[PDB]
Symmetry: D2
Subunit: 267 residues, 4 copies
Amino acid sequence: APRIGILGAGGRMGRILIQAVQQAGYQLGAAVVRPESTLIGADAGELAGIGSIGVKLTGSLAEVLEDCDVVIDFSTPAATSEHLKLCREAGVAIVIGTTGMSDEQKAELDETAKHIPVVYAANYSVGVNVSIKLLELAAKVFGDTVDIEVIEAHHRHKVDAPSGTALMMGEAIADTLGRNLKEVAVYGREGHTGPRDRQTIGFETIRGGDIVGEHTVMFIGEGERVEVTHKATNRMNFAAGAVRAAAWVVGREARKYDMKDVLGLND
Amino acid sequence: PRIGILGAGGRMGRILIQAVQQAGYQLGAAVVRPESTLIGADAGELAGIGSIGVKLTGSLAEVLEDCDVVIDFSTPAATSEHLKLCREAGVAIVIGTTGMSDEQKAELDETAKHIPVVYAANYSVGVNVSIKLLELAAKVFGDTVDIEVIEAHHRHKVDAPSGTALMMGEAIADTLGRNLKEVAVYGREGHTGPRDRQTIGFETIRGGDIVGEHTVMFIGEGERVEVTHKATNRMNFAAGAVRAAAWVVGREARKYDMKDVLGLNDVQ
Amino acid sequence: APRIGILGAGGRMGRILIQAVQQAGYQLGAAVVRPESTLIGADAGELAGIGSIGVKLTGSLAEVLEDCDVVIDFSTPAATSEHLKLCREAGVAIVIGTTGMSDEQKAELDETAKHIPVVYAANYSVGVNVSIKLLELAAKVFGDTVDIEVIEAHHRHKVDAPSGTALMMGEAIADTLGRNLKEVAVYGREGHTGPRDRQTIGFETIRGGDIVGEHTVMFIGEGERVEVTHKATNRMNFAAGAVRAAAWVVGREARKYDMKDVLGLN
Amino acid sequence: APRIGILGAGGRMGRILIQAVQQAGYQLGAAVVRPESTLIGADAGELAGIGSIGVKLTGSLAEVLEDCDVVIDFSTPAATSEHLKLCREAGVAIVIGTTGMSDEQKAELDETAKHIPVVYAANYSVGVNVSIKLLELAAKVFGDTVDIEVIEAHHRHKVDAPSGTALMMGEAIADTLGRNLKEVAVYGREGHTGPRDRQTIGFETIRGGDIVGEHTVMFIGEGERVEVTHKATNRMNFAAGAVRAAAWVVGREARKYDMKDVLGLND
């Protein structure tokens, strides 16, 4: 079985990753926090809400890398830089989900991936990555015979429209169909719009309440319609995907991998 | 009741004949333009329900004695003469002609002072029911929900959102005391910021051959209530018009709409 | 403004009820716990996660009734029995959402409701109660011209099908249409079922994953369809409804009330 | 450009197929009916509601096969047998959508498919075949991590439950996951069902009104859900797929093909 270490194990996301490791039947290899954290010495399982599991929060990643085959890192881009060097010298694979890394930090990641296996993905949700593959496959088959509309819904606090996931989906469809998203995208409809251009990709964005996040793509043809939909119940399905990527990457050739590799979608 | 169909030759007329027979009523008459080719043919056979013993006439006045109520889905000029004739004969009329002139609509109100007249923006029973549900849900939820209107229609529709969506949004704004033109939003792009509670959002989907779907979302904290109307075809106006026709027979001469016909004004 | 007290303030539902009182802008009048609870003396606002609010947890309901105009009780039927007798003597209204009261305990409630105002509802979610009213109205208008199908979805751990909410919706429609649900209900379809009887009310129950709770009623006609749907994001929309009932019932005549009364649906 | 002939050109499906041939820009090569038909001599385009196109209904398939590269046959299994022998001797490919052929009649097809190209598919809707491929792919990735539920809706007259299309989808999913559908299928839920078995594939069948046909497969996981949905607006989307298969099969090696081949779904 693979030994998975969780970096930043004290934060909100770390605790979820600890539950995901134990729920997948894996051994928690390590739980690391900042060397000055209040929680050093606490039980990771107790802290994660699953009761004691015998792994305690430590503050030195280098001291626990021998106990791990892979580590999962959802922290700060600066902390990921230090985590990359330690895993390189120790030969431990790393699954990185840190958002907002600089172009220099992202380059440091790419060169590390020539020495250790590295997983880097924009989204670790298994369902989202699956959805994208379905969209690409349906788009290749439907070709120019369907009107493509992207509908998403989110809570009333979201400041951006459409969501990054909705745009990620439209981008994959536009790449598949050979269209330029900025040219063919439409974000509203009011008044005498005229009839619909087949090249148009329409984005309908719903805002309200506390909706966690729903995305639907409609391939609308003559006489029929195919919908691909992903709905999130909570903000926690990154963990199951990240843990699945960690188990998958153990013992593989040193390259940079994404969730398309992990899920066998590049076929 | 004996129900007559005006403009019985057209696409909508033929559907109305089916609706009368499908509702178990006796078709009292079937009238077409006085220069129509089909004058003399049997209405039932032409409508696809087999012979029923009523033939197409080009003279509405000659068969008014054979009817208790008549249904008119034609052109605004054709209804005006038909409205005048029904007044003198004392036969009720259900009018669904779109785009009636300001003088013709005033002629209707005076006609409704002599005979009962039904005039509604939409004769689909489901659409009218939904709008009542929207009003009822809106009054109870008040300002505790973010309201979003989603509709879908075929790729040939030139106007957005549909009249039905705006009719629904208008009903909600009136219940909530909002001005729809002030609070409506038809698209979202870029840094929209957080949602204003007063906003009523309209998301319009276009594609393929979708006949017509409308969903209103009352989105609160922890839960959501949706009212949805979906149309399979463009013929569900007929069942309502026939229902309005049977309802208006033998009633006091006023102007009625589908809220009266469906008993929707009786709950608040 | 009304002073609302929360019973069982240490439990999961009690803490949520404290948040709902503060989220609605009301002043928390009291917070009572089991007489053997550890938390007596701690601050309710802090204990509920909204920061200190100046109300401390007590173990004596009788000692704090003077500070409240109404109390909300989501506890056990045995504890509710003591709460019903105590609230009667103090003249404080009570909102009860305890499930599973005995036929004798429910009778104790009805006799109590002759002295103090009592709100008792099967479901305190505002959305659900609204949904049932939409169903009743749609059912009255459509009559026997539509096929009615009830679809619900819940997480994979739910042992009962259909949900109580779905049956509550189905029952409301059957009463409107004059049908006997036990006679006309259908819970599955397999093989040569034949054509559909118009009287049938069909129940499609979806089970999977962690779905909190979705309920859809379809009025399916010829050429069109009307759907009324309620979707739950979490298990907490009872609290806002209960708090709204608490504020609504303050100072009213002593009867038994439900959420139809609170929301003006009757 | 392929010359497509339509057999049974007088019937409901024949008229729809004529529309589909012209809507695709193809040449109507022939329009054939029974030699004793009333419609012999009528213009196929006029009969299909698209105005004259200059091809008239004939009663002899052998006399017009030289005008065709492929023919489309939605008739009776007895008539399809005769058309197979004629197309074989004439070397013209054929697309068959006739339902209910015997095990011997299906064998006549397989031996014919060694001489001429033959397309035979259970369902010619492009969207449905796309949907099935999407289900197989999602099922392979999710594996045993999701509860799978099939929801379908049809008009109040449908006598069979679930629909053949819903069963077809469950069969594709059960095959991908290594499950036996008859063992894991559940068609209703009433009373104390207990908690859900992960292996179960649940079928919820909706009946009412005049619904043409809706099918939804829910892959329900922990924290998220992915739905694949196909909706039919009318009973005519078989035609476009059959026409698309007709053009695809022209000039290909004599084998038996299905819509997975036509749409590039095999891999």
